[model samples]
Target: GDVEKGKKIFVQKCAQCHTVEKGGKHKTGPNLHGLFGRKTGQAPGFTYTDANKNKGITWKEETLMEYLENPKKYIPGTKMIFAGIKKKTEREDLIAYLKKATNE
Candidate 1:
């Protein structure tokens, strides 16, 4: 429940591109607003790979955790810029915070 930490982490690391607020538009990447329970690559307006086009993935806590850990490894040819969080605690906290941040 360290939402404050997660919020700060998200802002520092993510705010530059993806938005976490409703009606937020995509800049470099797709908006993460209301991301939970939503299928990956289904953000609309954003083009996706063939792998993603069919049965897009979901951004659950576990999926996001793994993706955040290593985007390239998790989904080959994906366009996510993040390499992964160094600290496991930070990743976990961020995932927890995201779960709460998006009320989906």
Candidate 2:
């Protein structure tokens, strides 16, 4: 996955609702700093749905790839309304960007 392409994808797809920088404020979605190893629905100050909170997923490349394909399918009743990225490569690029940006 290309990090540069992924950054562009994030700006287009995710920046509207999420923030990846450390200590960034939660937007409509949660601040995503340190997301890779964190459990689902654990981002502080973001109120997550019971479905997401109880899903018990630990965010990693594999799980994120699945989840990004279809958030509603992966965790039913999630509040996120974004339809999701259908292309696998786009998802991979986005995840690669998140892996770096969220940890910064």
Candidate 3:
């Protein structure tokens, strides 16, 4: 699933604001330690915008892909600043890496 490539993409685009390692600290964004199956905006110690906090959705592969494509559209007023991952393959790879990293 191009784990290495995904890791590189994450470091370049997401690592600065979030953490993928288990039990990692939160930065500008919450730690994505255990991403899949988690509820949106439920990260401990991280304050999210009201829209995100009230989003009654769970994170999963499909939802992550959709959200990654356009976060603001998925959850209006979300604080995520990325312009969205336009490439489908890149998004999939990143999601795969996230799954592997957080599973440990």
Q: What TM-score against the true fold does each predicted structure earn? A: 0.84, 0.97, 0.94
Better of 1 and 2 by TM-score: 2
Ranking by lDDT: 2, 3, 1
CA-lDDT, candidates in order: 0.76, 0.93, 0.88
Highest-lDDT candidate: 2
Q: Which lDDT tens digits does candidate 2 get at residues 40-65? A: 98998889989989999799999999
Candidate 1 lDDT over residue span 1-103, tens digit each: 4778888888888878777666678888776777888887777676767655554577898788888887777887766677878777788888887887666
In model 2, where do residues sit more than 4 Å from their true spots? none
Clashing pairs in 2: none
User: What residue runs in model 1 are displaced by over 4 Å at the alpha carbon?
Assistant: 51-55
Q: What lDDT score is found at residue 74 in candidate 1?
A: 80
Q: Tell me the tens digit of each residue's lDDT in model 3 across 1-104.
A: 68999999999999989997777999999988777898888877889999888888999988989999988999998888988999999999999899999778
CA RMSD, predictions in order: 2.0, 0.7, 1.0
